[PDB]
């Protein structure tokens, strides 16, 4: 079943399923791959490791708070 409030949530979420979201997911995938991780944990310093690797992979960074919106649906 689908409740109205999960639908509304799905509608707002769509707006951040965007270019820098999939690029962030692929940076995270490469972090797990590089380290042979079975699990990735939301721990201190991960936000910085993601930001560095994204900047080195794509040449730019998006704003800090955007990462928080991405992480709240990834984790």
Q: How was this structure determined?
A: X-ray
- Joined together, the tokens standing for residue 18 give 């965007």
d(CA 24, CA 36): 18
d(CA 16, CA 43): 23
d(CA 65, CA 46): 15
Neighbours of 44 (CB within 10 A): 7
């Amino acid at each position: 079943t689908l409740t109205m409030d999960r639908l509304e949530s799905l509608i707002k979420e769509h707006s951040i399923i965007d270019d820098n979201y999939i690029k962030t997911l692929l940076v995270i995938k490469n972090l797990m791959l590089k380290d042979n991780l079975d699990t990735l944990a939301m721990v201190r310093g991960l936000n910085v490791k993601i930001r560095k690797a994204f900047k080195a992979t794509y040449g730019y960074n998006y704003n800090y708070i955007k990462l928080t919106e991405y992480l709240s649906i990834i984790f």
